[PDB]
């Protein structure tokens, strides 16, 4: 009968140098680190979409409550939290006609339909960015639910109503990377869930008990997209750089390729957390192989080390490479040929496939979050999802799944690796929640990869995450 080890919950940092575990509570009490003056919003869509967005923007300012304010904290309003203005008066409208949407919506080919709709929105975006004298921080694209339903890669258009990825969101964000415009895509049913009902006279999506959670998530995403920093890590060490590598399949070309994207996190001399991407997805011409060539591995590590040195002044002491795959010998030897003697290379594999479930004997709740089961000096299990005493509820749904964290290559302390991963799980800026399951490096590398492998014509993409997430 085996033993477990507990890893303390990490604390994130907020305004006035105040540490907390919950992002929502820390934002409510102290506030963001940045001082944005206000958010100027550009809205694209039909007149109904503009009305929906204006109504939601007016609704945001007033406090919003949930069914339980212990499990899910309430939203006290946008300005009361972020201390900046995001009002409906600063809205810039670029109308898209319903007739124009219907002209391209009902087409035989899903590729042609999604390309036409994506181009219809992007043409207005770029025309307003270039030929209009007003400044817009974030562009909010209100999308009718038909466009969402009928633009999926595998979606089929009913016969009665009859490169680049066949997906509205990824192709939309991939074709806007040349102009560096942060965009937030909304569905009309998200902000007006009450007005869309099913055959039984009830809404399809019920946000009655989680209205404040929706407000939290939307407001945090909008604040991050406008150039604000809501929080940052507090316990991360100096001289260590975290890398996260994700491979994606590219079906745009005739020959399948495995594009590898990365995410890089570290600490600058100003105590600010530098978290960005690592792009120019290094491809592999062999189908089914998710291992980098020596040349591409050398290029990746050289670029990462050069970026770290430029931002700091010296090469990192430690480098951690979180990947969902296992590095092989040739790729690791290629990696080691770039690192200097002072830089220690550690390659960690993070997976969620191993089926180990721990059931509490005498309760209706689940295993505590932060528990670990160190298999051996190079392998452990980490429970990043589970019961959180602070919110008196579990992040998982039925029984949480563990993360099998294994130090595949290099020498490092396994407990330190688990602590680093559990601290990374607090850096998700796409959502305003308690810490999620996967580390932020792998998740954001996946988010980058899902967009960079949509459109082929991306020479040098930006590094900021507001253009991807």
């Amino acid at each position: 009968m085996k033993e477990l080890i507990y890893i303390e919950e990490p604390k994130i940092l907020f305004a006035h140098g105040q540490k907390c575990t919950d992002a929502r509570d820390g934002l409510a009490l102290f506030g963001p680190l940045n001082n944005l003056y206000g958010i100027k919003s550009g809205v694209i869509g039909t007149k109904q979409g503009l009305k929906i967005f204006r109504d939601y923007l007016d609704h945001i300012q007033k406090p919003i409550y949930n069914s339980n304010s212990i499990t899910r904290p309430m939203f006290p309003g946008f300005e009361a939290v972020f201390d900046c203005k995001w009002e409906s008066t600063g809205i810039t409208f670029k109308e898209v006609t319903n007739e124009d949407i219907g002209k391209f919506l009902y087409n035989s080919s899903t590729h042609k339909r999604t390309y036409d709709l994506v181009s219809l929105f992007i043409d207005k975006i770029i025309s307003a960015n270039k030929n209009e004298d007003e400044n817009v921080d974030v562009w909010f694209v209100i999308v009718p639910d038909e466009i969402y339903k009928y633009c999926r890669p595998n979606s089929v258009l009913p016969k009665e109503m009859v490169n680049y990825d066949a997906q509205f969101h990824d192709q939309f964000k991939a074709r806007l990377l040349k102009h560096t415009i942060p965009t937030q895509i909304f569905r009309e049913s998200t902000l007006a869930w009450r007005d869309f009902k099913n055959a039984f006279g009830l809404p399809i999506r019920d946000f009655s008990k989680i209205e404040g959670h929706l407000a939290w998530t939307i407001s945090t995403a909008a604040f991050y997209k406008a150039g604000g920093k809501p929080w940052k890590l507090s316990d991360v060490r100096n001289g260590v750089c975290y890398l996260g590598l994700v491979y994606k399949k590219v079906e745009k070309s005739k020959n399948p390729r495995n594009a590898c994207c990365a995410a890089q996190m570290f600490l600058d001399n100003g105590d600010g957390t530098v978290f960005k991407g690592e792009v120019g997805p290094w491809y592999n011409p062999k189908n089914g192989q998710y291992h980098l060539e020596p040349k591409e591995a050398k290029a990746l590590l050289s670029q990462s080390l050069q970026s770290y040195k430029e931002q700091i002044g010296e090469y990192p002491k430690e480098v951690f490479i979180h990947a969902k795959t296992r590095f092989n010998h040739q790729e690791w030897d290629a990696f080691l040929e770039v690192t200097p003697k002072e830089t220690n290379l550690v390659g960690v594999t993070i997976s969620k496939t191993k089926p180990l479930k721990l059931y509490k004997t005498e309760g209706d709740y689940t295993i505590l979050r932060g528990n670990a089961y160190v298999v051996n000096e190079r392998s452990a299990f980490l429970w990043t999802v589970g019961y959180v005493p602070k919110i008196q509820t579990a992040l998982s749904m039925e029984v949480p799944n563990p993360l099998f964290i294994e130090i595949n290559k290099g020498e490092a302390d396994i407990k330190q690796v688990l602590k680093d991963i559990l601290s990374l799980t607090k850096l998700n800026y796409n959502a305003c929640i308690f810490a999620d399951g996967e580390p932020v490096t792998l998740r954001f590398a996946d988010k980058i990869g899902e967009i960079l492998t949509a459109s082929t014509d991306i020479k040098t993409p930006p590094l900021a995450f507001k253009y991807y997430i």
Partner: protein, 100 residues
């Protein structure tokens, strides 16, 4: 504490607190101290409930100038701080460590 300690009496005005017995007792005690202390602005109602109309506030409050928290809490807190600095309400140096 109402009689000997407080310099300002903030009252959260809502539909629940409009006719609550304990809140009314505290309001009566605060009114007594306000008359004793010759302080015209001892009681400050903060209107936070949109349901409770301005025509339904209780008799001890219907004459006072309230702070509107209905539309925005940030504006209400700005008004509270502006009144506190204008009325020379005693305060120490700001410190988030106490709140934490």
């Amino acid at each position: 504490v109402i009689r000997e300690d407080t310099c300002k009496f903030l009252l959260v005005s809502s539909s629940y607190s409009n006719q609550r017995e304990g809140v009314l007792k505290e309001l009566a005690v605060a009114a007594k101290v306000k008359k004793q202390l010759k302080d015209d602005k001892f009681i400050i109602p903060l209107a936070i409930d949109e349901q409770l109309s301005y025509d339904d506030i209780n008799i001890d409050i219907v004459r006072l100038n309230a702070i509107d928290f209905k539309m925005s809490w940030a504006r209400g807190l700005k008004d509270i701080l502006e009144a506190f600095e204008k009325q020379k309400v005693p305060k120490e140096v700001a410190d988030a460590s106490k709140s934490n």
